[PDB]
Design a protein around this ligand. Sequence first.
Ligand code: DDQ
Ligand code: DDQ
Ligand code: CA
Ligand code: CA
Length: 448
Amino acid sequence: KEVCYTPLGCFSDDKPWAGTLQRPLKSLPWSPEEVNTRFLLYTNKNPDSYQLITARDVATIKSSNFQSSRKTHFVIHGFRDRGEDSWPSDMCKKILQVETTNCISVDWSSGAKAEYTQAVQNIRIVGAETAYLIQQLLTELSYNPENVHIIGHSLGAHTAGEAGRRLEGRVGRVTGLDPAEPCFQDASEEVRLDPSDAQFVDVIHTDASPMLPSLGFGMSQKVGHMDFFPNGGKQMPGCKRSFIDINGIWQGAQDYLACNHLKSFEYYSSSILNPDGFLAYPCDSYDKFQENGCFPCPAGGCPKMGHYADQYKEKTSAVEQTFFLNTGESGDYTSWRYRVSITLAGSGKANGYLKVTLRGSNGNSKQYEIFKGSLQPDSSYTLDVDVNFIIGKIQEVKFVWNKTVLNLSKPQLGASRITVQSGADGTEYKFCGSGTVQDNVEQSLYPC
Ligand SMILES: CCCCCCCCCC[N+](C)(C)[O-]
Ligand SMILES: CCCCCCCCCC[N+](C)(C)[O-]
Ligand SMILES: [Ca+2]
Ligand SMILES: [Ca+2]
C-alpha cells in the first residue's frame, strides 16, 4: 500500500518498512512538503549564515559557495531535534575551523516533530531528499560520491544509512552517532544502518542499555566497520541514568532521560577539535578493558574516535571491529589513558588506599587510588587510569596512603618501584623511591 513522491520515488508500506516485529503497525511516510527537509550550506567562505540550497533548483547550488574541489560533511539530526541552530549547525562550524570544506546541516525538524512511529518513517523521505541532492552533485558537477561524509545522530544515523543505501554504498563515509534502537535493532539492513551503506561506517554507542524494560535509546548492535563504546557505551559520565520539552510536564525529565543518548554527538563534536582526545583501544569486552587489558595503543596506533576515525589503516579490514575507551565527565570530555604499577616494599603487613598524583608538565592531576587491600612486602599492584586532561610527561609523581585496619605494628612501607606508562605510545617513566618512609607522606619517587 505504497505512495509516490516528486523525484524521490516510492515507499512501500510493506515489510521490512512496516509489519515487522520491529515496526508492528503499518504506516507510511509523510510528504516531502509535510517534513520540510532543508539543506543548509556552510563553507569556509560563509561560516555563520547558511545558504539554502535545493536539489530541486540546481541554480541554488551552482550559485552557492559549495566547492566541488572539497569533501562534503552532512550532519543529520533525529527525533524531535532541529538543524537550524541546534548542535548540527554548531558542528558544521567546528568542522570548518580545521579543514577547508563543505558542511551541510540537514534540518527536518517539522518531520521529526511527529510521533516516533511516524518519524521512523519520515526518515525514509529525508534519506531520499539527501540521497537525491547527492545524485545531483554527481550528475551536475561530477562530484564524486566517495567525497561525501554523512554524520547522523539517533534517528539521523539511520537516515544517513538510508541515503547511503540509495547510492549503492558509493558514499565514502557515514558516521552513526548513537543510532536509535526502537524499530531498528535486529531489523533488515534495508531499514537500518549497517556497514554496507557506505565505503566506511563508524559508530559511537553512548546509550546502548536495552530500550525495553529499561530505556536505552541506543543500539547495542554493532553496525559499522568500527563500533566504538565510550565508557562501555551504556552509562556515560556526567549523566545520571534513566519531547515537546517534557520539562513542561516534569521539570528535568528531558535532560535526565536523553543525556547519554546525546553524549554521542558531544564526544564527536569535541573530537573534531581534539582528535587526540578519544583514542579507542581494541578489545573483546569493556570489562577486559576496565580490568587493565588491551593496553597500550596497538602496533600502528589507536584509532582516533570521532572525526579522525577515517585515518585508521585497518578502518575497513573488518566489520563490527570494536573498541573501548573512557571519556571525561565534562567540557571537551578528553581523557588520556595511562598505566600505573606499584610494587610494594618494607617489613610489616598493613591495609589501605594507595593514592598518587601527577605534575607532568602542563598541570597536575587528581588523587588516584591505585589499590586498596593487603600490602605485603615486594609484590606488585597495577591499575589503568584516565587523565581528564593533557599533561605531558610524568617523572613527577606524589604517592600518599591511608589506613583500613588500624594496627599490627605501623611498618616502614614505601614503594620500591612505580612503573608509569602512556597509552598512545608506550613511554614508561618508572621510578625508584629508595627511602621507604612509613605512612601518609608525599614520598616523591623519581627517574631511573
Ligand atoms: C529514539 C528516540 C530518541 C529520543 C531522544 C529525544 C532527544 C531530544 C532531542 C534533544 N534536543 C531537542 C535538546 O536536541
Ligand atoms: C531528580 C532530578 C533529575 C530529574 C529526574 C526526572 C525523572 C522523571 C522521569 C520522566 N518521566 C516522564 C518518566 O517522568
Ligand atoms: Ca542499511
Ligand atoms: Ca577526516
